[PDB]
Scaffold this active site. Structure first.
Site, PDB file in Angstrom:
ATOM      1  CD  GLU A 120      -2.656  -1.683   0.216  1.00  0.00           C
ATOM      2  OE1 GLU A 120      -2.668  -1.020  -0.851  1.00  0.00           O
ATOM      3  OE2 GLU A 120      -3.334  -2.719   0.370  1.00  0.00           O
TER       4      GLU A 120
HETATM    5  N1  AMP Z   1      -2.957 -10.454  -2.744  1.00  0.00           N
HETATM    6  C1  AMP Z   1      -3.156  -9.115  -2.691  1.00  0.00           C
HETATM    7  N2  AMP Z   1      -2.121  -8.281  -2.455  1.00  0.00           N
HETATM    8  C2  AMP Z   1      -2.264  -6.949  -2.415  1.00  0.00           C
HETATM    9  N3  AMP Z   1      -3.444  -6.330  -2.588  1.00  0.00           N
HETATM   10  C3  AMP Z   1      -4.579  -7.037  -2.822  1.00  0.00           C
HETATM   11  C4  AMP Z   1      -4.498  -8.508  -2.892  1.00  0.00           C
HETATM   12  N4  AMP Z   1      -5.746  -8.943  -3.132  1.00  0.00           N
HETATM   13  C5  AMP Z   1      -6.552  -7.847  -3.211  1.00  0.00           C
HETATM   14  N5  AMP Z   1      -5.853  -6.707  -3.029  1.00  0.00           N
HETATM   15  C6  AMP Z   1      -6.371  -5.322  -3.023  1.00  0.00           C
HETATM   16  O1  AMP Z   1      -7.780  -5.358  -2.952  1.00  0.00           O
HETATM   17  C7  AMP Z   1      -8.337  -4.602  -4.058  1.00  0.00           C
HETATM   18  C8  AMP Z   1      -9.673  -5.167  -4.436  1.00  0.00           C
HETATM   19  O2  AMP Z   1      -9.629  -6.579  -4.534  1.00  0.00           O
HETATM   20  P1  AMP Z   1     -10.828  -7.383  -5.207  1.00  0.00           P
HETATM   21  O3  AMP Z   1     -11.909  -6.317  -5.083  1.00  0.00           O
HETATM   22  O4  AMP Z   1     -11.186  -8.566  -4.335  1.00  0.00           O
HETATM   23  O5  AMP Z   1     -10.505  -7.642  -6.667  1.00  0.00           O
HETATM   24  C9  AMP Z   1      -7.256  -4.679  -5.121  1.00  0.00           C
HETATM   25  O6  AMP Z   1      -7.388  -3.674  -6.116  1.00  0.00           O
HETATM   26  C10 AMP Z   1      -5.990  -4.546  -4.290  1.00  0.00           C
HETATM   27  O7  AMP Z   1      -5.789  -3.189  -3.930  1.00  0.00           O
END
Ligand code: AMP
Length: 268
Positions: free
Chosen positions: A172
């Site tokens: 982040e």
């Molecule tokens: N393994 C991961 N590592 C870092 N950030 C993540 C990860 N999985 C999800 N995120 C964060 O969560 C946000 C939304 O995830 P999602 O909505 O589940 O596709 C992403 O745009 C990332 O900022």
């Protein structure tokens, strides 16, 4: 759908836990500069290249965190297209993955990298303590992870807290100037928790990225405010974002085009 090239990072970024604020700020800056699409800027901020259409994830970098000057470090495997943490290597040499069956030869850690997975409820994010000690404890806890730690409830809980810490102080911080700045401050000659605005930014990386990109489309266009992040203008957004996720916005670059610009510009 397994990953390719996890063991062949595009670059390796190293940080010593005991180093200064300055060293941390340039460590973060270095990661942004190396991930950028050299040909695609928005409001003076770097933008990532698109995720490649129909291949498994093939672009990776490593971050090595050393709890001590000479000590071997903890290695993080992070995707170069979207900055997802997907794996870490332990002192015994085991690759632990955060997505089942993603990394050749890895062992699934037992949970994923979403804050939902790690904390149960994303609102708990503003109660996570960040600082030099937390960073050192997180690195030591994951470096010392054994396979037997997986059937232990309390060990699994500590691992989640450690991963959560790394996510905030590494991933982040790369994504957000507000977060990297906040962390650099904790490392000045030491504990802190992010506010609700930083929590909203961290949960809205795509939205905030997409909102800056929209302002760049050539008109036939104003910035949509995001109140909960405290971001009401293009300039506050440009000052909040460290590096943008690529998003296919109407009238901006497509996935295909931005990718060809990536390759033609000396990006891999
Ligand atoms: N393994 C991961 N590592 C870092 N950030 C993540 C990860 N999985 C999800 N995120 C964060 O969560 C946000 C939304 O995830 P999602 O909505 O589940 O596709 C992403 O745009 C990332 O900022």
């Amino acid at each position: 759908k397994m990953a390719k090239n996890v063991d062949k990072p595009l670059f390796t970024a190293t940080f010593n836990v005991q180093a200064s604020s300055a060293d941390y700020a340039t460590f973060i800056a270095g990661i942004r500069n190396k991930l950028r699409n050299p040909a695609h800027f928005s409001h003076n901020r770097p933008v990532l290249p698109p995720v490649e259409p129909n291949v498994p994830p093939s672009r990776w970098f490593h971050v090595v965190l050393k709890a001590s000057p000479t000590s071997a470090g903890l290695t993080l495997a992070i995707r170069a297209d979207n900055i997802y943490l997907e794996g870490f290597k332990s002192s015994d040499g085991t690759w632990w993955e955060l997505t089942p069956g993603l990394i050749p030869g890895a062992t699934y850690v037992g949970f994923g990298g979403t804050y939902r997975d790690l904390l149960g409820d994303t609102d708990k994010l503003t109660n996570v303590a960040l600082g030099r000690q937390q960073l050192a404890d997180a690195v030591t806890a994951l470096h010392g992870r054994t396979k037997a730690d997986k059937p232990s409830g309390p060990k699994q809980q500590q691992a989640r807290e450690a991963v959560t810490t790394l996510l905030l102080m590494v991933n982040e911080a790369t994504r957000f100037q507000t977060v990297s700045g906040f962390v650099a401050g904790l490392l000045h000659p030491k504990s802190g928790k992010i506010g609700n605005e930083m929590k909203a930014q961290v949960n809205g990386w795509q939205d905030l990225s997409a909102a800056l990109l929209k302002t760049d489309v050539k008109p036939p266009a104003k910035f949509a405010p995001i109140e909960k992040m405290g971001v009401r203008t293009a300039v506050q957004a440009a000052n909040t974002l460290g590096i943008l996720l690529f998003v296919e916005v109407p009238g901006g670059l497509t996935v295909a085009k931005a990718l060809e610009l990536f390759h033609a510009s000396g990006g891999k």
